[PDB]
Amino acid sequence: RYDSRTTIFSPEGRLYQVEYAMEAIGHAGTCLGILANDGVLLAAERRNIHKLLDEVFFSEKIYKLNEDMACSVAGITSDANVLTNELRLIAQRYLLQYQEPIPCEQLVTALCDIKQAYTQFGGKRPFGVSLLYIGWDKHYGFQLYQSDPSGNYGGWKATCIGNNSAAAVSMLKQDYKEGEMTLKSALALAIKVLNKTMDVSKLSAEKVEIATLTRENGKTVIRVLKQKEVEQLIKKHEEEEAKAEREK
Amino acid sequence: GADREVQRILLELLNQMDGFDQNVNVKVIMATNRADTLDPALLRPGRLDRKIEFPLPDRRQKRLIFSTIT
Amino acid sequence: LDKQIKEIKEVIELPVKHPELFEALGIAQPKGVLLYGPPGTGKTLLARAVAHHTDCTFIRVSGSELVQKFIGEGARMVRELFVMAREHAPSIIFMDEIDSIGSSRLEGGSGGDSEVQRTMLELLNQLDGFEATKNIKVIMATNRIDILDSALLRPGRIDRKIEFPPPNEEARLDILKIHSRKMNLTRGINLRKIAELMPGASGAEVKGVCTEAGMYALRERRVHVTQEDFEMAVAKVMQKDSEKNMSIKKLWK
Amino acid sequence: SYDRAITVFSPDGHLFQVEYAQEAVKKGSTAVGVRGRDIVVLGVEKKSVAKLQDERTVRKICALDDNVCMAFAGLTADARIVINRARVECQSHRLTVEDPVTVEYITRYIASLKQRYTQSNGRRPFGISALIVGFDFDGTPRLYQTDPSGTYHAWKANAIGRGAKSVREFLEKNYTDEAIETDDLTIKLVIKALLEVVQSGGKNIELAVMRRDQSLKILNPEEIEKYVAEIEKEKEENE
Amino acid sequence: SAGFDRHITIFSPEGRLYQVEYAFKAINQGGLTSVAVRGKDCAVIVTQKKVPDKLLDSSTVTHLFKITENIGCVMTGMTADSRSQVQRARYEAANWKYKYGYEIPVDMLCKRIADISQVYTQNAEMRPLGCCMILIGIDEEQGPQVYKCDPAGYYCGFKATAAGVKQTESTSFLEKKVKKKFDWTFEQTVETAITCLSTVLSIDFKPSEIEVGVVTVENPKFRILTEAEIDAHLVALAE
Amino acid sequence: NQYDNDVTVWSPQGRIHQIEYAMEAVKQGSATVGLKSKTHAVLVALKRAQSELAAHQKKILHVDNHIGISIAGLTADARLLCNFMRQECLDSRFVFDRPLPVSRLVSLIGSKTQIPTQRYGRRPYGVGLLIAGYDDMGPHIFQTCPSANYFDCRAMSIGARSQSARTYLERHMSEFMECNLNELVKHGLRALRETLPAEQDLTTKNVSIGIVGKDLEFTIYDDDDVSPFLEGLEERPQ
Amino acid sequence: TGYDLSASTFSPDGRVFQVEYAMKAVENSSTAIGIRCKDGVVFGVEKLVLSKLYEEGSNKRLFNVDRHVGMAVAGLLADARSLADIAREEASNFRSNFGYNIPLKHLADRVAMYVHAYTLYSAVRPFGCSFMLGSYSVNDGAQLYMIDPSGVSYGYWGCAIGKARQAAKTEIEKLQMKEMTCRDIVKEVAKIIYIVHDEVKDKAFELELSWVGELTNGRHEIVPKDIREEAEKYAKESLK
Amino acid sequence: GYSFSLTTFSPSGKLVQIEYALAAVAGGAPSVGIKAANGVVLATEKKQKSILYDERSVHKVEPITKHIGLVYSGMGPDYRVLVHRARKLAQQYYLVYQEPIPTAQLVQRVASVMQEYTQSGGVRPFGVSLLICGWNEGRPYLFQSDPSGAYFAWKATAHGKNYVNGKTFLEKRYNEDLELEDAIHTAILTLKESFEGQMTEDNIEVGICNEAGFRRLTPTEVKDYLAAIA
Amino acid sequence: YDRGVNTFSPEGRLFQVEYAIEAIKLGSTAIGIQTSEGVCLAVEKRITSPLMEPSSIEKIVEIDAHIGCAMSGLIADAKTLIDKARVETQNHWFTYNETMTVESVTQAVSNLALQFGEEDSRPFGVALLFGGVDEKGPQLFHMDPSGTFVQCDARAIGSASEGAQSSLQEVYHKSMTLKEAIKSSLIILKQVMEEKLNATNIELATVQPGQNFHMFTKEELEEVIKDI
Ligand SMILES: Nc1ncnc2c1ncn2[C@@H]1O[C@H](COP(=O)(O)OP(=O)(O)O)[C@@H](O)[C@H]1O
Ligand SMILES: [Mg+2]
């Protein structure tokens, strides 16, 4: 059977297994890299919904590769964990060799390349994880990247994957902003898209996990948003929709 | 093909369960050994009206069964 | 389903009820519509309603019924199905769960099907050849459109797509009122709360919840229902009593 | 005995999986390369910047040498893999061999890599074809094509991808046997070919030029639109 | 049902490993029972030596083995698998003495054997060994221990539960014997074991038809009871 | 068949039909005949013709000053085994300057052919080999088969249409034992003739000879060498 | 067919049904008996011989395992040859490492381990042969062990393998095999081989005798029946 | 379905074999682990097929470190191999960093090995759900790992037979400020709800992590909590 | 009996490499003639387009200054075989300083061809024709994916090999001058295979014992075209 093994093409040449990996990503928790300037953000609402969930790390979706590198997670949980460990390993290799921070595109290409190599050989299951990168480097500064199971990578200023990914990117292209669209407007737009995509009326703070990178002192900081800031962000978006109602 | 065919069997069974018209007084009862299995779509309350257990006869019940046959 | 019913009313009713515009426009009438959504989302109900209002005859044959155990039978059954379609003249043809044959086909091994594809291409010829498309239309339903293929979807073939998302708050209210219209309600019933306490309802499960409230009333020999009956009926029809812990967040996230 | 695999033959002898790789290449976008009198030009189409997308990151044209460049059309993951291999091979050959790299050697290396990747069980072949243009043909321009069958050929001008059937005939229609004087003329012909883009707009065509002695040259959209305007003026002559 | 049982490293839809259950269907090995009993100062194992033909030398037909001066073993399963498991236990015990300087304990030995069965259960490279196993040993000032290890890869070494054809009747008889309070001497323990064997098998039990191993805190050297001792016990219980 | 894909699976018949199919692969080859005397061991091969202008394929191989072989089967496996005999003869002579005894060489060939018959995913060498040798113990003619069974034989014939030659060799078994070199080689030629159809007879095109003796090294004879051998032999009447 | 396709998957019912095909394979081959006399073990093996194209002693089924260890096999001859080489390897390993002669029990158990291990791996198959090993250690006595394709190593005072195991065993059972000496045992073995279908349906065959014993100095030898052929005369006298 | 092979995807993106492993889970031994204000309590049943089985011979709560306690879902031998690996991994971390292994990090490494077994075409995962109690930097931690290689943090949870009742129990029978004694009482109460048949010192075993150290309960203490109480 | 060469059919034939002969069939033809004056090879390019560089298709190759090669089948596997033949000639000459017998080159390439189920991939789907000279005679040889090889005086391989082979058999004899054999080959290829001769799709290569230079025919086909 063609679809049973990753090394067999369709008669049309398409690969069924990586397609199945993307339709898997279809189940992933909604998470996006928002459109921002002089800053960047990686909002990733947590699908984890249960009272006794401890969330002791307070972060299970956004993982900091270094103080200038953060990545998102959308895919198989264990595959995502081992992949994030491999990201940290590769960044460590580059830094230990050069004593310089790794560029965004180079690290993204390295991970996607090892992913493609894993998908290419037989007897091995493709990594069913797609992910996003927010970073700042010497060559290009602020960058957001998207990567798929096949090993394909690309640059997106604002993108979303996971649950209703198509709808999310659709309304992101709908009310698209550019230029003066700074980090705060990025938080507002991320709040908007998260409330629209999620079915929760008055989206709860614990259900969403947001992180952001900002160039402080030239050394940069990556802050994962705590409960309070998410709280007034969501409350401000709610009163903003109330304001939109007031126009009528 | 056997797997796809058994899945179509289950789907046709559910379609007939929801599809038997009103004013027809047919009752449908299913037996099972485990009941921890069985698709919740069939266990959907819109077509399951009661779930009755028949555990192994214990004391008293074994006595009643033995007396009844004997 | 007001948005869905308006789209389908256009696509189906407008040609049969008012062919002249299409003759005035010169364009041939659209042939068929595909419906996709979660199971129980009134797709068959809506198709049946359209069949009723446009006064055209209703013929239903499920895709699971199409398979059969023998080669050369699905082709025959589809062709004669459209024979009944033509002999009944103004009519609509329903293929519930066409995805059962509109599915992935076995790509080699210890065996193969080769007949699901054959019934598919036979139906594809029948609707492609616009066989006597005078007051005859087709409609099919598919669960989780993703499993379906684009072979029937190719432009000159079936023309329109419809989505049947899970009912929202207002839709749940309407379904509750519609099905409980016959029920013997009691003062103090607040159906809005029950609708709120049922996020992500499948529409048919709303019929399930009202049937369950009636069953609770019946098992106590009451011919009347209360808010409490619907409230504990929600507890059984929530359908995640067997869910929320089959390890979903894990290994899938 | 049908295909079902990579290392078994159909009863008539054909290997179906390499044909499937050919079909996978056929799914890819257009890519039409030529070599002129002295310069080699390339133009890639169907950029389709998705608004929120920034086009530059994908890098539809990649240079891996002191002087050689083109991507590989098909699945871009295999393209990046073979890009890394081409980087490694060109740098190693330049460092190790008494003389620098030549286009023929790198083309043979890529073909052999594809063949050795195909010739085994449990190893998915690279379903990507490419058009290599190099400078050091003893200081002459020349063009090769690489096919996932692990095969390489030397064209005067070739097209692969979605327009492979069309543009090739277009080439056969007007590839002038007179060597293209004022290689700008060959670049205008390439622009006319790029007017046959998948979107046919011509406003997002990414073009590269290398005069067989120069390094990599990149054509900006405005100066490429200048050649598009010259081609349009030539086309309007039919009046 | 078919499919989750063709290979060992596949779970059933209910999560059942079919092949581990399959391996239990050769532990029957019609003819052996292997009753094990623990008494206040002794540990006894007895097996039903079912000799099928006269020409065999009865010494080689034995099914009880020893690798420790104070540890005895009895097997129940396919004979080649039994002897291979005994050799593996000998290997492990020899490694333990060579490493730690003192002989392996009974609990640790059975755990190691069960872990070997487990690693062969989890990996599809090899069939798990189809035979169950019982040790008797002594732990320092702590007493006699009887341990069981099966192709399930797990151990519970407890009190008895003979892994022979007469599973349930023998197990229930041992429960009933221990379900009533009584003392436990070496003679009483061997009497309990032999009574279990006789009542579950109902044969006349000639002395050559059974084979007994035993350990005791009075003399911790694991010994196989002679036919004279076996017949003395038989006549003691008969009267 | 369910139990006939590989050599590792046993049939209910108490057989492995893959080995049997290797035997059929062997009999698919053309006939070869071997016979020995107290003086010489001779083998003859029916070289299959490819066309009237192509070389008739070699079927007698020569690796030793005192040992030769005649093959019937896939040329790949036969020549791999020939290179194997090259290796063993060479290191034996290197170790103790001794021309390797043919019997132990045949035993080694059988042992090394047995390995594919017990391992999954490796075809047994589907060839049958006739081995002629002379050693300090005597003259010797063996056969080796993909079932790895090795046999010693005074007279013998393998391949297609071999039954008539086998019967002829049985009949003249009473003769070979004190036959000289010329009588033995002529009887082998007639035995190979027995295999052929009526219209096909011994000719230098399809006949190859290989001879080892107590006073002569193993040598192969072909068109220019076979021509003296065939002349003077009785023709085939109807 | 069930799951009886590989000897590593435990088929329906504890019986693998894969090795129980190797026993059928052993059943195919001709009989081969062996008797432990007072001072030695006599291996009497009949090998069916098509006198056509033969070499009056080719491909004999008697082989030397060790200078003192003799053996007999029934079943596939190639497996017998390879495992005879393996047994020679094991005997040489013991001889080199321990500095003295290998006990027959340990050699038999190690060969049974080899057989049992080959029964298990999926990529390999069990041997289609059952065999019987004999030796005499002048220090303590005589040893004999018979091992089946499954790897079961058991002792026999007298044993048989092949196409007539039960018939040959019944013939052996009435021998006064308790006390007599191997010399008459050779004749007993020959006539027992001949009484069970010498040439009734199969045209011709040859009889080979292997002998280890104290009077034979304790080493393994082939009985030189060329002297007066007394066992051959006895076997042909067994005509009635 | 797509379960006979471990290294392939289904058309819907599911690798059916691992949810088959999770179905083997929750069919095994019931067990409940909760986190109190101070310590962490894990309880599991000990009920064998016959009375002959000396249950004290087979402990189920195992101390990985003096500060770590471990409980499984019921897959015995797989639990044993995994607990051996976990003990060795904890030892490696203890010697490499010269500090005891963090509870969360220990669970991470264990789940990493678990994921390592979730690949190739000739191996199978250990169908075991693991409950880990630990103390780290004065903070109590309760974690759960599952054969898929995923791991999560729970204030309270349960797995094994009749696990949904334990989930509801810890939903309404829990508050995060529970004392240790009341935590053990809640654990034995949810064990009573989930289990079938009575219990004594013989039938249950419990391990408690406190910030000073972890310890598995003696059966006498297990009876003290289970019997004469609740 | 379809998975590979490690399976034997009831008739013994391995049902994998018959498909390798059929893969020989799907390739374009190649002709070789062995004459006392010289050994010649003719080869059809099957040129897809004139935009192709005709010499880029390496269906005619020079193994060494004393041996040339043509072949039919799969071009990549053919190139691998050609590469091995060249490195084998290089190594053997550099070590022993004696000329590699063409038969020895066939032996080495065949020994490589026996590397799909004989160690530890798939049969090399290509058949080769070698034409060479040596200190003892000018020879022509043919070999196939099975690893067997044979000495031929006039051989045809590839598509439609039967008709070309029949014509080659009918025209051949042992006393032809190389000119007459060459011309017969060209007229046969013209009549049966594609069309009239042209430098774009046909190639020729000849070898003579005393000529280690210009092993090919190139830029001189003109005299043929007018006088063919
Ligand atoms: N929006 C709705 N309004 C009223 N009834 C509904 C609605 N959605 C579902 N139902 C009820 O649920 C049932 C769904 O049946 P069907 O239409 O066959 O579902 P599907 O088309 O998904 O198979 C119908 O009988 C209908 O009465
Ligand atoms: Mg419906």
Residue numbers in the entry:
A (entry chain I): 4 to 251
B (entry chain D): 280 to 349
C (entry chain C): 154 to 406
D (entry chain J): 2 to 240
E (entry chain G): 6 to 244
F (entry chain L): 4 to 241
G (entry chain M): 5 to 244
H (entry chain H): 5 to 234
How did the manuscript describe this experimental structure?
The 26S proteasome unfolds and degrades hundreds of proteins to maintain proteostasis, regulate cellular processes and generate peptides with second messenger functions. It consists of a 20S core particle (CP) capped by one or two 19S regulatory particles (RPs) that gate access to the CP proteolytic chamber. The redox-active thioredoxin (TRX)-like protein TXNL1 is expressed in many cell types and was proposed as a nearly stoichiometric component of the human 26S proteasome. It uses its C-terminal PITH (proteasome-interacting TRX) domain for binding, while potentially reducing disulfide bonds with its N-terminal TRX domain but how it binds and is regulated remained unclear.
PSRpt4 was not previously observed in structural studies of the substrate-bound yeast or human 26S proteasomes. On the basis of the locally refined map, we could reliably determine that only two subunits, Rpt4 and Rpt5, are ATP bound while the other four Rpt subunits are bound to ADP. This is a strong deviation from conventional models of always having 4–5 ATP-bound and 1–2 ADP-bound or empty subunits and again suggests that ATP hydrolysis can occur further upward in the spiral staircase and ahead of the large movements and nucleotide exchange of the substrate-disengaged seam subunit. We refer to these PSs based on the highest substrate-engaged Rpt subunit in the staircase as PSRpt1, PSRpt5, PSRpt4, PSRpt3, PSRpt6 and PSRpt2, represented by ~19,300, ~112,200, ~29,500, ~32,200, ~24,200 and ~73,100 particles, respectively. They all show typical characteristics of the substrate-engaged proteasome, with a shifted and rotated lid subcomplex, the Rpt4/Rpt5 coiled coil positioned near Rpn10, a coaxial alignment of the ATPase ring with the open-gated 20S CP and the substrate polypeptide threaded through the central channel. By contrast, in PS proteasomes, the PITH domain gains high affinity through additional interactions of its C-terminal tail with Rpn11’s catalytic groove and a coordination of the active-site Zn+. The preceding PSRpt5 is the most abundant and likely most long-lived conformation of the hexamer and its transition to PSRpt4 is linked to two ATP hydrolysis events, suggesting that the movement, nucleotide exchange and substrate engagement of Rpt4 are slow steps during substrate processing.
